[PDB]
UniProtKB/Swiss-Prot annotation, chain A:
Miscellaneous field: 'Taube nuss' means 'empty nut' in German.
Inducing stimuli: Induced with triglyceride accumulation.
Official protein name in the record: Transcription initiation factor TFIID subunit 8
The organism's taxonomic lineage, starting at the top: Eukaryota, Metazoa, Chordata, Craniata, Vertebrata
Every Histone-fold domain range: 12-79
Domain description: Ectopic expression of the histone fold domain acts as a dominant-negative mutant resulting in differentiation inhibition.
Included range, full protein: 24 to 155 of 310
From Swiss-Prot, chain B:
Residues bearing PTM Phosphoserine: 203
Name under which the protein is recorded: Transcription initiation factor TFIID subunit 6
The protein's assembly and partners: Component of the TFIID basal transcription factor complex, composed of TATA-box-binding protein TBP, and a number of TBP-associated factors (TAFs), including TAF1, TAF2, TAF3, TAF4, TAF5, TAF6, TAF7, TAF8, TAF9, TAF10, TAF11, TAF12 and TAF13. Interacts directly with TBP, TAF1/TAFII250, TAF9/TAFII31 and TAF12/TAFII20. The TAF6/TAFII70-TAF9/TAFII31 heterodimer forms an octamer complex with the TAF4B/TFII105-TAF12/TFIID20 heterodimer.
GO molecular function annotations of the record: aryl hydrocarbon receptor binding; DNA binding; protein heterodimerization activity; RNA polymerase II general transcription initiation factor activity; transcription coactivator activity
Full-protein positions shown: 6 to 473 of 677
A GO cellular-component term linked to this record: transcription factor TFIID complex
Curated annotation (Swiss-Prot), chain C:
Assembly and binders: Component of the TFIID basal transcription factor complex, composed of TATA-box-binding protein TBP, and a number of TBP-associated factors (TAFs), including TAF1, TAF2, TAF3, TAF4, TAF5, TAF6, TAF7, TAF8, TAF9, TAF10, TAF11, TAF12 and TAF13. Component of the TATA-binding protein-free TAF complex (TFTC), the PCAF histone acetylase complex and the STAGA transcription coactivator-HAT complex. The PCAF complex consists at least of TADA2L/ADA2, SUPT3H/SPT3, TADA3L/ADA3, TAF5L/PAF65-beta, TAF6L/PAF65-alpha, TAF10/TAFII30, TAF12/TAFII20, TAF9/TAFII31 and TRRAP.
Source species: Homo sapiens
Subcellular location(s) of the protein: Nucleus
Protein name: Transcription initiation factor TFIID subunit 9
Gene name of this polypeptide: TAF9
DNA-binding region: 108-120
Similarity remark: Belongs to the TAF9 family.
Included stretch of the parent chain: 13 to 132 of 264
Superkingdom: Eukaryota
Induction details: 6 to 8-fold by apoptotic signals.
Functional description taken from the UniProt entry: The TFIID basal transcription factor complex plays a major role in the initiation of RNA polymerase II (Pol II)-dependent transcription. TFIID recognizes and binds promoters with or without a TATA box via its subunit TBP, a TATA-box-binding protein, and promotes assembly of the pre-initiation complex (PIC). The TFIID complex consists of TBP and TBP-associated factors (TAFs), including TAF1, TAF2, TAF3, TAF4, TAF5, TAF6, TAF7, TAF8, TAF9, TAF10, TAF11, TAF12 and TAF13.
UniProtKB/Swiss-Prot annotation, chain D:
Medical condition linked: Intellectual developmental disorder, autosomal dominant 73: An autosomal dominant disorder characterized by intellectual disability ranging from mild to severe, developmental delay, speech delay, behavioral abnormalities, and non-specific dysmorphic facial features.
Family designation: Belongs to the TAF4 family.
Function: The TFIID basal transcription factor complex plays a major role in the initiation of RNA polymerase II (Pol II)-dependent transcription. TFIID recognizes and binds promoters with or without a TATA box via its subunit TBP, a TATA-box-binding protein, and promotes assembly of the pre-initiation complex (PIC). The TFIID complex consists of TBP and TBP-associated factors (TAFs), including TAF1, TAF2, TAF3, TAF4, TAF5, TAF6, TAF7, TAF8, TAF9, TAF10, TAF11, TAF12 and TAF13.
Subunit-level organization: Component of the TFIID basal transcription factor complex, composed of TATA-box-binding protein TBP, and a number of TBP-associated factors (TAFs), including TAF1, TAF2, TAF3, TAF4, TAF5, TAF6, TAF7, TAF8, TAF9, TAF10, TAF11, TAF12 and TAF13. Component of the TFTC-HAT complex, at least composed of TAF5L, TAF6L, TADA3L, SUPT3H, TAF2, TAF4, TAF5, GCN5L2/GCN5, TAF10, TAF12 and TRRAP. (Microbial infection) Interacts with SV40 Large T antigen.
Subcellular location: Nucleus
Parent-record interval covered: 837 to 1085 of 1085
Domain of life: Eukaryota
Region (Minimal region required to interact with TAF12): 23-65
Length: 132, 412, 120, 154, 90, 489
């Protein structure tokens, strides 16, 4: 369940993003194989600006990418970057809230115990205590 | 002995693909030529995806192993589409396509939006424990599992001291001590081979603890029983013949201490006892021994004339918590008797006895059970005065309880 | 299914006992992608030779012209042993005693001032 | 050209404006070159419009690669520190220089110890091989090839 | 600097894809979240790609609106040079 | 195919797939098997019966295949038993010649030892005053070091990764048990401090310019307290990190991954410094030298490269394996590199001249773990057959076989004294072997009669809760550390 969820939370958000862009277009009720196709092209697109803008900045001896490394990355994917300020200011756009995180409930209960036998001198104090 | 073969994909699947593309009239030698080439590439990749399984230290080939095995053979990991130019996605895995054989092949586009997203699991943390203490593996939860000679007890003195501390903590002088001792009972792996002495301490305790009706002593022992049951390591159905008559006694017995006031707890003593009773009939089940035996004792407790009303209330609760069908088949032909008992308590002036309190509790519990028993097997039509055909006990208030249940179902 | 039960026998003949259920579904998706790019190129080669029937030499051509580009391999042993002996002949350089953090030249490292935009 | 909205059409049209914002092979030795490889297949003579078609095909192969390495050889000639729309975030080189100065102080202490022991006794763009290697592992051809693998050692 | 101005405006802008999900697939490829606005521009670029494919597919559906079928994605991605594949094996 | 020995099933399955010529023309492992010669060590008492059945014209065709494709290396001695031949075969182009295992190997430790190399043989780096300060507190740990033996069995402290839903693929611990690195499948390296001392980065260059050097505190002055965590995540690999290696001065983490790069992460700035791009293919392992300047990385391209953290290009290419170089381990004197591989051979490589000086064959699966004895005399290797084979290095002879484990043995380490070899595998067990009784005896037949003594050399087996033992480490006070992601499976 949790290992599936690690991958699935981030894929299901991608699928909801795809469904929302399809609705904005005009499509209501799409084919099932056409949604897992388009959300596979969406994950492969975020993973390709991840690998290529990291490659363009590290070619210039840097470690984190600036704006000038992505506007050359998107050019090498054929994007026509200038049309993006008009796309961001739509009136039809939605906002998909991010997948819920189990980290907020990170720790239910933490406690200590006594009567554990002492550490021998080949075990330092920072190792866990000997049990009951 | 090794009868290893060479299995290829069927050729009658390759002609279906060819004629659904525009390439008709293909020969069999042309079609067999396709299915040994592609069956080699599947065998070449699955042998190459097994390298990433071993390197990642897993025994299960995940879906991402084929994405790296394809990228290793200079083929794009993309499965759904193929980009001739290759510039929009260059050897970038899109994680495959979540498709099934038994799928619907058409969904509504607002069904995918309105479903709740799955919970992102916890991040990776580093906890340390002990596999071995100077050669011996500890039993912590991070680990898997002519004169005759003077004999020794089968418990150690650490184990006997542990038993004494756990039993003196489980009699509830301090609440934090109880709660740890209850969790210690609930998850000690080595609590077998001490379990006869725990079962005997429980059984013997309730029987000399109902001589004077000491409610805490009993509420603590029932919590000890509940903590004994949910422990997964120990084998309990050798000891359930002592456990079950102890809980029946908590539910079907009279209270020697003050009748009112703690009757609220007494209902919970009968609530905790009926919970553990139906949990014991859920487990340990063989043919016609345990569940039917306690069902028969509960029914002859019910049909017995002129009962103690404490015993009556406890047995009513016990028969009530037995599940879906049990109240569907048993509480049905008895509403008139319940109503007559309520009417007798009402008429007789006697108020200083416990009969009136017992009657009110029994009627409330029976009315709640009857409400869903009704919500479950009929529509909610005519909820005003049709229940007057069932002596008019809960009537419109029963209908309101059914409506609240329907609202909870709508929320679900 | 028909073609999905043969895929569980290709894995079991390779000794793969444990696998995810999505493993069969995407090896079939690759096998379908591979045969609809051999046969797509086979009728391109048939129209080049001007024959109305795509026969077995067209699929023999489309396999070996797709395997010449798609499925590559590591470099061969006579190529690896030639670049080894060309590299292993050069003697090891001496080390300067207090040069500092030993790194390549700065155009080969990832240590630059690493700028970012001003928030305004 | 077969695709009207093709994605490599928008690449090399926006790449040229990024470089604006900062072969013709010899016909006589090529015609002998095609014919010798033709002996291994039985292609004994060649059409007279082919040796100039391969020369036009070799030009558009290298011009697609000269333009590709020019837009990454000008990627390194963008100085951020002249602009003041950008802010510095992490300079590891300067921290390394301070560490080197501390190492030199340690070396000076060692030298003092040795002395005590003695007493007791118009921007121009140059394309490197990195810019060519960077434009080889990205394209699908020459990504797993013996010409890029050997280029890692040149 | 039109795009530098846009990225500077991208603070206070929430994109359709969350930054916990766009940043997850960027961390998977080595891209680390130094600046939120850069993650948001990458998210908007991916959104524009999917949206443009979807709008072309809708023009094809209107020509042959409503349901999106694989036979609408097939000519829509064909001008992009992308040959989409039917499942055909389930 | 069915009369072939059971240990050869994997190769037999790859061959059953190979039916065409062009299928084999791009395999590059059977392409190198067809051009090489099988070595086939046989005795002279059995070779006389073989050559009296092949020199006759009745079988001049199978004799023609033998003298074309097979070497035959003849030793004068007893014919080996079947359970001794089973112990030393299993590789492709396997059971190599004794003329390869007769070169002089300097298997001794540096500082007299006649087996020790000179200090100026390999140009090793200087020992700084901060590195000399490390060995002062290292011998304070050696004071509390217990003698383990077969009686005082060590305590094992398992450092399990609890959630780990990104798959953990690489662990390393520093030489003093202070840091634990984790290479994960989500392309991250994560450093954990295990001592009660948080991971701090050094201050920025503006903060270092205002402070002065020459101060006694200096390092303490430089630490930034604004950045202080029990966990630092390192981003920059575009693929699952498969190798992880600390430097002995506790800076300079190394990591290799599927994307074909080896990365040098600083542990003072906690950024990436260099990306070493020599492989185009998944680098399966990397390790720093025990003196900390050179490092070796083995990848899918069937070589192992020797780097120096100063050049963008390698110095030595170890290019004799026929399959993937799975493991790469340095000798304790760092003049020799052992590279286990997927063609079931372990090979020692001299850092001078790049020559293979030893070839160790006898594993039935790909080798997934190597370790050296602290003497430098011995080498323990583990593979997917669950066998731990103990090799001599001076004699080039296997000296023992430990066959207790069931699944792939993925981690080996000897004790700090050398008293116990610890083995961790995918059967979720940490087995301890007596590494003194296994080396009690120290040829021209090129083999020794192995004892079948595994039962007497097992001091104990400890089972993990559903947790494959990815790493094994020995504290300098002889305490076993082990790290593995808990996988419920």
């Amino acid at each position: 369940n949790p290992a599936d969820n690690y991958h699935l939370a981030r894929r299901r958000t991608l699928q909801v993003v795809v469904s929302s862009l399809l609705t904005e277009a005009g499509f209501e009720s799409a084919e099932k194989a056409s949604v897992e196709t388009l959300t596979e092209m969406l994950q492969s697109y975020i993973s390709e600006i991840g690998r290529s803008a990291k490659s363009y900045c590290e070619h210039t001896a840097r470690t984190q990418p600036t704006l000038s490394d992505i506007v050359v990355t998107l050019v090498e994917m054929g994007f026509n970057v200038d049309t993006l300020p008009a796309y961001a200011k739509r009136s039809q756009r939605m906002v998909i809230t991010a997948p819920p995180v189990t980290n907020q409930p990170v720790t239910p209960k933490a406690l200590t115990a006594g009567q554990n036998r002492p550490h021998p001198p080949h075990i330092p104090s920072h190792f866990p205590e000997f049990p009951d | 002995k090794l009868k290893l073969s060479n299995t290829v994909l069927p050729s009658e699947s390759m002609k279906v693909v060819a004629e659904s593309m525009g390439i008709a009239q293909i020969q069999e030698e042309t079609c067999q030529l396709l299915t040994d080439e592609v069956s080699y590439r599947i065998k070449e990749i699955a042998q190459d995806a097994l390298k990433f399984m071993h390197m990642g230290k897993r025994q299960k080939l995940t879906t991402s192993d084929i994405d790296y095995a394809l990228k290793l053979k200079n083929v794009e990991p993309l499965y759904g589409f193929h980009a001739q130019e290759f510039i929009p996605f260059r050897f970038a895995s899109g994680g495959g396509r979540e498709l099934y054989f038994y799928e619907e092949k058409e969904v509504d586009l607002s069904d995918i939006i309105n479903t709740p997203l799955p919970r992102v699991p916890l991040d990776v943390c580093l906890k340390a424990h002990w596999l071995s203490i100077e050669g011996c593996q500890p039993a912590i939860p991070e680990n898997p599992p002519r004169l005759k000679p003077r004999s020794i007890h089968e418990l150690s003195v650490e184990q006997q001291l542990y038993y004494k501390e756990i039993t003196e903590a489980c009699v509830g002088s301090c609440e934090a001590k109880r709660a740890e001792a209850l969790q210690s009972i609930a998850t000690d792996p080595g609590l077998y081979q001490m379990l006869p002495r725990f079962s005997t301490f429980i059984s013997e305790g309730v029987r000399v603890n109902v001589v004077q009706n000491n409610l805490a002593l009993l509420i603590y022992l029932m919590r000890m029983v509940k903590a004994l049951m949910d422990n997964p390591t120990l084998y309990l159905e050798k000891y359930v013949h002592e456990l079950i008559p102890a809980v029946m006694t908590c539910i079907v017995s009279r209270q020697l201490c003050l009748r009112p006031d703690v009757d609220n707890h007494w209902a919970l003593r009968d609530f905790a006892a009926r919970l553990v009773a139906q949990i014991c009939k859920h487990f340990s089940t063989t043919t016609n021994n345990i569940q039917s035996r306690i069902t028969k004792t509960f029914t002859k407790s019910w049909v017995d004339e002129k009962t103690p009303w404490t015993t009556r209330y406890g047995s009513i609760a016990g028969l009530a918590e037995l599940g879906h069908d049990v109240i569907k088949t048993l509480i049905l032909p008895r509403l008139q008797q319940e109503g007559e008992r309520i009417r007798s308590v009402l008429d007789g002036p006697v108020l200083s006895n416990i009969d009136r309190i017992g009657a009110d509790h029994v009627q409330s519990l029976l009315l709640k059970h009857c409400a869903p028993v009704l919500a479950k097997l009929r529509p909610p039509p005519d909820n005003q005065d049709a229940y007057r055909a069932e002596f008019g006990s809960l009537g419109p208030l029963l209908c309101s309880q059914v409506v609240k249940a329907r609202a909870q179902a709508a929320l679900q | 299914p028909k073609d999905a039960q043969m895929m569980a026998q290709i894995l079991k003949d390779m000794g793969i006992t444990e696998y995810e259920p999505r493993v069969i579904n995407q090896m079939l998706e690759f096998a379908f992608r591979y045969v609809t790019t051999i046969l797509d190129d086979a009728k391109i080669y048939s129209s080049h030779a001007k024959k109305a029937t795509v026969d077995a030499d067209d699929v023999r051509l489309a396999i070996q012209c797709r395997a010449d580009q798609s499925f590559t391999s590591p470099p061969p042993r006579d190529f690896l042993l030639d670049i080894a002996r060309q590299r292993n002949q050069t003697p090891l350089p001496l080390i300067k005693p207090y040069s500092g953090p030993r790194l390549p030249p700065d155009r080969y490292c990832l240590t630059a001032p690493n700028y970012r935009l001003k928030s305004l | 050209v077969a695709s009207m909205a093709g994605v490599n059409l928008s690449e090399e049209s926006a790449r040229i404006l990024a470089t604006n914002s900062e072969t013709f092979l010899l016909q006589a030795p090529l015609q002998r070159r095609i014919l010798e490889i033709g002996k291994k297949h039985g292609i004994t003579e060649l059409h007279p419009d082919v040796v100039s078609y391969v020369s036009h095909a070799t030009q558009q192969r290298l011009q697609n690669l000269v333009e590709k390495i020019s837009e990454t050889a000008q990627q390194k000639n963008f100085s951020y520190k002249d602009d003041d729309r950008y802010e510095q975030a992490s300079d590891v080189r300067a921290q390394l220089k301070f560490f080197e100065q501390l190492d030199q102080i340690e070396k000076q202490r060692k030298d003092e110890q040795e002395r005590e022991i003695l007493m007791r006794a118009q921007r121009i763009t140059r394309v490197n091989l990195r810019d060519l290697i960077f434009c080889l592992e990205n394209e699908r051809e020459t990504s797993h090839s013996l010409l890029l693998y050997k280029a890692f050692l040149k | 600097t039109p795009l530098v101005d846009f990225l500077m405006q991208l603070e206070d802008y929430t994109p359709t894809i969350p930054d916990a999900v766009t940043g997850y697939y960027l961390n998977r490829a080595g891209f680390e979240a130094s600046d939120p606005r850069i993650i948001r521009l990458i998210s908007l670029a991916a959104q524009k790609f999917i949206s443009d494919i979807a709008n072309d597919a809708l023009q094809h559906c209107k020509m042959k609106k409503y349901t999106l079928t694989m036979e609408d994605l097939t000519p829509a991605l064909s001008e992009y040079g992308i040959n989409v594949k039917k499942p055909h094996y389930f | 195919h069915g009369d072939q020995e059971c240990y050869y099933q994997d190769d037999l399955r790859v061959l059953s797939s190979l039916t065409k010529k062009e299928h084999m023309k791009g395999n590059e492992t059977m392409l190198d098997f067809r051009t090489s010669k099988f070595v086939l060590r046989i005795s002279r008492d059995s070779y006389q019966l073989l050559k009296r059945h092949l020199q006759e014209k009745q079988n001049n065709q199978i004799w023609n295949i033998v003298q074309e494709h097979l070497y035959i290396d003849i030793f004068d001695g007893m014919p080996r038993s079947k359970q001794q031949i089973d112990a030393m075969v299993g590789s492709l182009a396997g059971e190599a010649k004794r003329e390869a295992n007769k070169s002089k190997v300097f298997f001794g430790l540096l500082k007299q030892d006649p087996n020790a190399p000179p200090q100026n043989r390999i140009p090793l780096p200087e020992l700084k005053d901060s590195d000399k300060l490390d060995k002062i507190m290292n011998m304070k740990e050696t004071t509390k070091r217990v003698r383990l033996g077969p009686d005082c069995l060590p305590s094992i402290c398992f450092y399990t990764f609890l959630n780990a839903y990104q798959g953990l693929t690489a662990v390393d611990v520093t030489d003093d048990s202070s840091l634990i690195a984790g290479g994960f499948a989500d392309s991250t390296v994560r450093v954990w401090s295990v001592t009660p001392k948080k991971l701090r980065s050094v201050k920025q260059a503006s903060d270092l310019s205002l402070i002065d050097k020459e101060s006694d505190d200096v390092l303490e002055r430089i630490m930034d307290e604004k950045t202080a965590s029990e966990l630092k995540i390192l981003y920059g690999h575009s693929g699952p990190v498969y190798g992880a290696s600390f430097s002995p001065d506790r800076n300079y983490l190394l990591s290799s991954s599927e994307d074909g790069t080896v990365r040098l992460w600083s542990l003072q700035t906690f950024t990436c410094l260099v990306g070493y791009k020599g492989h185009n293919y998944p680098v399966w392992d990397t390790q720093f030298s025990p003196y900390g300047y050179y490092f070796v990385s083995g990848g899918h391209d069937r070589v192992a490269r020797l780097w120096a953290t100063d050049h963008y290009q390698p110095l030595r290419i170890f290019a004799g394996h026929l399959a993937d170089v799975n493991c790469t381990r340095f000798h304790p004197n760092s003049n020799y590199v052992a590279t286990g591989s997927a063609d079931r051979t372990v090979r020692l490589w001299d850092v001078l001249n790049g020559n293979c000086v030893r070839i160790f064959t006898g594993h039935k699966g790909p080798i997934h773990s190597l370790t050296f004895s602290p003497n430098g005399r011995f080498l323990a290797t583990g593979a997917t057959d669950g066998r731990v084979l103990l090799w001599d290095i001076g004699h080039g002879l296997m000296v023992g076989e430990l066959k207790g484990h069931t699944d792939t043995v993925c981690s080996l380490r000897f004790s700090r004294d050398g008293e116990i070899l610890a083995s961790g595998s995918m059967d979720n067990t940490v087995r301890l072997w007596d590494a003194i009784k296994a080396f009690e005896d120290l040829t021209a037949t090129g083999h020794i009669n192995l004892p079948e003594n595994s039962q007497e050399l097992l001091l104990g087996t400890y089972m993990t809760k559903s947790t494959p033992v990815v790493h094994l480490h020995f504290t300098r006070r002889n305490l076993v550390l082990a790290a593995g992601a808990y996988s419920p499976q």
